[PDB]
Design a protein around this ligand. Structure first.
Ligand SMILES: *[C@@H]1O[C@H](CO)[C@@H](O[C@@H]2O[C@H](CO)[C@@H](O[C@@H]3O[C@H](CO[C@H]4O[C@H](CO)[C@@H](O)[C@H](O)[C@@H]4O)[C@@H](O)[C@H](O[C@H]4O[C@H](CO)[C@@H](O)[C@H](O)[C@@H]4O)[C@@H]3O)[C@H](O)[C@H]2NC(C)=O)[C@H](O)[C@H]1NC(C)=O
Ligand SMILES: *[C@@H]1O[C@H](CO)[C@@H](O[C@@H]2O[C@H](CO)[C@@H](O)[C@H](O)[C@H]2NC(C)=O)[C@H](O)[C@H]1NC(C)=O
Ligand code: NAG
Ligand code: NAG
Ligand code: MN
Length: 743
C-alpha cells in the first residue's frame, strides 16, 4: 500500500551537531571509501582522477573568474558541477596538497560572487542551483580542511544562496510545476544547503527550507506513482536531468529523515527507460523531445543507484559499464564540458561492487518494448552494433504522458492540481506518429535534436491549405506547433488536448508491425478522420511504412508533406524507373529510401539542410520533404527503407476501397504486405505479411488496450505523514546543542 522498501541499504543515521562530513557519508566511513578507490571502485576513482588531473593541468581555464562580470556572463553550471568532482577527489586523496589548495581557491572564487544568477537570465534559478549544490557539497566534503574563516564565510554564502532559492520557490513556476526538471533541480540545491545549515545549528531557517522542499517533492512523487512504465515525458536526456536530483532526494531524505521511497512503483520500472531507449552500440539514445544525442547527466550514476538500491542484480552496473566503455571522445555525442563530470562523485558513492556486472537475460535478442505512459515503442535497443542488428522507434501518445494528461483532463488530485498550470510540457515536440530507424546500428532516419518546436523538424506530416494563418505559409502541422513569435489566443485549448495513440505493436517471427493514429494531434477543423501510420519491418535492413489519410467529406485539404530527418548527414536525390527516392552515404555503404502513392506515382522530393537559431546547442538538421496529392477521400502512400546489404528489384503497390497491397522483391526474398482500410478491433486483422513462404498475421492480438490508472488513495495524507518525519530530527539537534551550552 506504501512506496517504502524497509530493506534498502541506506541506514537512517541520527544527526550529530557540527559533525563533518555528513551529507552522503560520515567521517568514519572515509577510510572505507579510500579502500574502495584502490580496489573495487578503481574504475570510477580513475575517472575522478583524470578529471582533476585535467583541471590541475590548466587551472586558470577551469577556475571560476573572480570578476563577477566574467563569472556571470555565460551559462555557468560548469563551476558547481566540476567542484563536486574535485571535492570528492580531495576526500579520497587527501595527501594531494595541490588539489586541496585548488579546491580552496575554487570555493573562494565562487564565494566572492555577488550573485550566482546568469546575467541575462534573472528569473532562472537553475544556475544558482548548480553553484549551490556543488558549493555546499564541497563545504561538507572538505569542512575539516578549511580555515575557521572559510568555515564561517562559506556558511554565510550557502545561507544566502539557499535563502534566495527558498524565496523564489513561492514566486516561480518550478515551485508548482510537478515533475518538470527544474523542480527537483532547484529543490535539491535548497535541501543540500538546508542540511549543511541544519547540521551547524541553524535550525530556524533550515526548518522552513526543509519543510518547503519536502512538501513540493513529496507531492510530485505521489503523482509519479501513476507513471507506470518508468518513463519521463520530457525524454531520456531531460529525464536524466530530473533523476540526477530525484535520486539525490530519495537517498538524502532517507539517510537524514528516514523518509523511504525505495518501494516506489515508478522507480522499479525505471531501468526499462534507460535499457530500452539506447541505440545499438551504447552511444546514443532515441533522442525524442528536446534532447542531445544521449543523456544530459550520467547516466552511470543513476544506473548504479538503481542496482544498489532497487534491482540488486548487477544489470545496472552492467549497463553503466557498457555506456562508460563506449562513450564518444570527440564529435557528435561527446558529453559537454559543463556536464561531463557532474555525477562522478555520486556514481562513486552509489556503486555496489558486490553486484558483479550481469546483463539482462534477453541481452542480444532484439526486443519490442512499449512505454504505455510515454506512448513510445522501441525495438532492438541495447544491441551490439552489428550488421542486421537494427533499432526502430515509434512515438504516438498523450501530451505529458498518459498520467499527466489524464490527471489534468479528469481533474484528479483536486487539492493540488488546477489544470495544465501545474505541469510544463514545453520541451515536448510536435512529433506524434514520428519514428526513427537505425538499420545495422547506422542512424538512417533520426530525430532532430534540441530545436525550435516546428512540426517539420520531426518525422511527421503537415497539411497544405490551412484554415488559419500561421507561419509555415499555407502549411499547418500539429497543434503544439509554436512559432515562438506569437502565441494564438485560446489555441492553448487545442494544444492542451494534443494526443497520438499507438494502436498496435507486435513482433512476430522477426517481423515488427506498429500502427499509430495521429488525428488527435491536428486541429479538428481540418475535418481529418484518420492520420494513420503503419510500420512493417520485413527484415532488419528493410522497413516499409504506409501512411493512410482519411479525409472527411467537408475538409479542404489538398496535399500532405512528410518529413524524414538525418541530423548528421544530408540526403541525396535518386530515381530508378520513375520511382523517386533519397539516400545518405555512410562509411559502410549507401542507405536508400523510395516512395510512391498507391496509384504508382512518386513525386520528386525537396531537400533541405537547416541550421538552428542562435541559442540552441546543436548545429541543425537535414531532411527530405516528400509531398503527395491527397487522392479522393482516402489517400495512402508507401515508403521503403533499404540498408546497403539488400538489392530491391521490384516495388509495386496496388489497392482499392478496402485493401492495399505492397509487393517487394529482392535478390534473395519476396515480400507481400496487405493492409486494410478501417479499424481492426473486433472483426478482422491489421496486416498480413507474406515473407518468402511464411504467412505472418497481425490480428486483434497485437492491439493495445488503454487504461485509466486510479488516483492514489489518501494522497494528501501520504504527504502529511512524510512531512512529520523530519521534525524529530530537528528536535534532537536542538537538544544536543542545548546539552552543550549547559556544559
Ligand atoms: C535485473 O532487474 C531488472 C529490473 O527488474 C531486470 O530488467 C528486466 O529485464 C527483462 C529482460 O531480461 C525485461 O523483460 C521482461 O522479462 C520478463 C522475464 O523475467 C524472468 O522470469 C521469467 C519467468 O517469469 C523467465 O521466463 C525469464 O527467462 C526471466 O528470467 C518477462 O516476463 C517480461 O514479459 C514477458 O511476458 C510478456 C507477457 O506474456 C510478453 O509480452 C513479453 O514478450 C515476455 O515474454 C519481459 O520480457 C523486463 O522488462 C526488465 N524490467 C525492467 C523494469 O526493465 C533485469 O533483467 C534483471 N537482470 C538480471 C541479471 O536478472
Ligand atoms: C515542403 O515542400 C513543399 C513543396 O515544395 C513546400 O510547399 C510549397 O512552399 C512554397 C513556399 O512556402 C509555396 O509557395 C508553395 O505553394 C508550396 N507548395 C504547395 C503544394 O503547397 C513546403 O513549403 C515545404 N516545407 C518545408 C517545411 O520545407
Ligand atoms: C548575505 O546577504 C546579506 C544581505 O541579505 C549581506 O549583508 C551579506 O554580506 C551576504 N553575505 C555573503 C557572504 O554574501
Ligand atoms: C557543426 O558541428 C561540428 C562538430 O561536428 C562543429 O565543429 C562545427 O563548429 C559546427 N558548426 C558550426 C557552424 O559551429
Ligand atoms: Mn523531435
Amino acid at each position: 500500500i506504501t512506496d517504502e522498501n524497509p530493506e534498502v541499504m541506506i541506514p537512517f543515521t541520527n544527526a550529530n551537531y557540527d559533525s563533518h562530513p555528513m551529507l552522503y557519508f560520515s567521517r568514519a566511513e572515509v577510510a572505507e571509501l579510500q579502500l574502495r578507490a584502490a580496489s573495487s571502485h578503481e574504475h570510477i576513482a580513475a575517472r575522478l582522477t583524470e578529471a582533476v588531473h585535467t583541471m590541475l593541468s590548466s587551472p586558470l581555464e577551469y577556475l571560476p573568474p573572480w570578476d563577477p562580470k566574467d563569472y556571470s556572463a555565460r551559462w555557468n553550471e560548469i563551476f558547481g558541477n566540476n567542484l563536486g568532482a574535485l571535492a570528492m577527489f580531495c576526500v579520497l586523496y587527501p595527501e594531494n596538497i595541490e588539489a586541496r589548495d585548488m579546491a580552496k581557491d575554487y570555493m573562494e572564487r565562487m564565494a566572492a560572487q555577488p550573485s550566482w544568477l546568469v546575467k541575462d537570465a534573472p528569473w532562472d534559478e537553475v544556475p544558482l542551483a548548480h553553484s549551490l549544490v556543488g558549493f555546499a557539497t564541497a563545504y561538507d566534503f572538505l569542512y575539516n580542511y578549511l580555515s575557521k574563516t572559510q568555515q564561517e564565510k562559506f556558511l554565510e554564502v550557502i545561507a544566502n544562496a539557499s535563502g534566495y532559492m527558498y524565496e523564489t520557490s513561492y514566486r516561480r513556476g518550478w515551485g508548482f510545476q510537478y515533475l518538470h526538471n527544474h523542480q527537483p533541480t532547484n529543490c535539491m540545491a535548497l535541501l543540500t544547503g538546508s542540511l549543511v545549515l541544519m547540521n551547524q545549528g541553524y535550525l530556524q531557517e533550515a526548518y522552513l527550507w526543509t519543510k518547503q522542499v519536502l512538501t513540493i517533492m513529496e507531492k510530485s512523487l505521489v503523482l509519479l506513482r501513476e507513471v507506470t512504465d518508468g518513463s519521463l515525458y520530457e525524454g531520456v536526456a531531460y529525464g536524466s536531468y530530473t533523476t540526477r536530483s530525484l535520486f539525490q532526494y530519495m537517498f538524502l531524505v532517507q539517510r537524514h529523515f528516514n523518509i523511504n521511497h525505495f518501494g516506489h512503483p515508478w522507480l522499479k520500472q525505471h531501468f526499462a527507460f534507460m535499457y530500452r531507449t539506447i541505440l545499438p552500440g551504447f552511444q546514443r539514445t532515441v533522442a525524442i523531445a528536446d534532447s542531445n544525442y544521449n543523456w544530459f547527466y550520467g547516466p552511470e550514476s543513476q544506473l548504479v543507484f538503481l542496482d544498489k538500491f532497487v534491482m540488486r542484480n548487477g544489470s545496472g552496473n552492467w549497463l553503466a559499464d557498457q555506456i562508460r566503455r563506449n562513450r564518444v571522445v570527440e564529435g557528435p555525442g561527446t558529453p559537454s564540458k559543463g556536464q561531463r563530470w557532474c555525477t562522478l562523485h555520486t556514481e562513486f558513492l552509489w556503486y555496489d561492487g558486490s553486484l558483479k556486472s550481469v546483463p539482462p537475460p534477453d541481452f542480444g535478442t532484439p526486443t519490442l518494448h512499449y512505454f504505455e505512459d510515454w506512448g513510445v515503442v522501441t525495438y532492438g535497443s541495447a544491441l551490439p552494433a552489428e550488421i542486421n542488428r537494427s533499432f526502430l522507434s515509434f512515438k504516438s501518445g498523450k501530451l505529458g504522458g498518459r498520467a499527466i494528461y489524464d490527471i489534468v483532463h479528469r481533474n484528479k488530485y483536486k487539492d493540488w492540481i488546477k489544470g495544465w498550470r501545474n505541469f510544463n510540457a514545453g520541451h515536448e515536440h510536435p512529433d506524434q506518429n514520428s519514428f526513427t530507424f537505425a538499420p545495422n546500428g547506422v542512424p538512417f532516419i533520426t530525430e532532430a535534436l534540441y530545436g525550435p518546436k516546428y512540426t517539420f523538424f520531426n518525422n511527421v506530416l503537415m497539411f497544405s491549405p490551412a484554415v488559419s494563418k500561421s507561419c509555415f505559409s499555407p502549411w499547418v502541422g500539429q497543434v503544439t506547433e509554436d512559432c515562438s513569435s506569437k502565441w494564438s489566443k485560446y489555441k492553448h485549448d487545442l494544444a492542451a488536448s494534443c494526443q497520438g495513440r499507438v494502436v498496435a505493436a507486435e513482433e512476430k517471427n522477426g517481423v515488427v508491425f506498429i500502427r499509430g493514429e495521429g488525428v488527435g494531434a491536428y486541429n479538428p477543423q481540418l475535418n481529418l478522420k484518420n492520420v494513420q501510420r503503419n510500420l512493417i519491418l520485413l527484415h532488419p535492413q528493410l522497413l516499409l511504412l504506409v501512411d493512410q489519410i482519411h479525409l472527411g467529406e467537408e475538409s479542404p485539404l489538398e496535399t500532405a508533406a512528410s518529413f524524414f530527418h538525418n541530423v548528421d548527414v544530408p540526403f541525396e536525390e535518386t530515381v530508378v524507373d520513375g520511382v523517386h527516392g533519397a539516400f545518405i552515404r555512410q562509411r559502410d555503404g549507401l542507405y536508400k529510401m523510395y516512395w510512391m502513392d498507391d496509384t504508382g506515382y512518386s513525386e520528386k522530393a525537396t531537400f533541405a539542410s537547416v541550421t538552428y537559431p542562435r541559442g540552441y546547442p546543436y548545429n541543425g538538421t537535414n531532411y527530405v520533404n516528400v509531398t503527395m496529392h491527397l487522392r479522393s477521400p482516402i489517400t495512402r502512400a508507401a515508403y521503403l527503407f533499404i540498408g546497403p546489404s539488400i538489392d530491391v528489384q521490384s516495388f509495386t503497390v496496388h489497392g482499392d476501397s478496402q485493401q492495399l497491397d505492397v509487393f517487394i522483391a529482392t535478390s534473395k526474398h519476396a515480400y507481400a504486405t496487405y493492409l486494410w482500410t478501417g479499424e481492426a478491433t473486433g472483426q478482422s486483422a491489421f496486416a498480413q505479411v507474406i515473407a518468402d513462404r511464411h504467412k505472418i498475421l497481425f490480428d486483434r492480438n497485437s492491439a493495445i488496450k488503454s487504461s485509466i490508472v486510479p488516483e492514489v488513495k489518501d494522497y494528501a495524507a501520504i504527504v502529511e505523514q512524510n512531512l512529520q518525519h523530519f521534525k524529530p530530527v530537528f528536535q534532537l539537534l536542538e537538544k544536543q546543542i542545548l546539552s552543550r551550552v549547559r556544559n
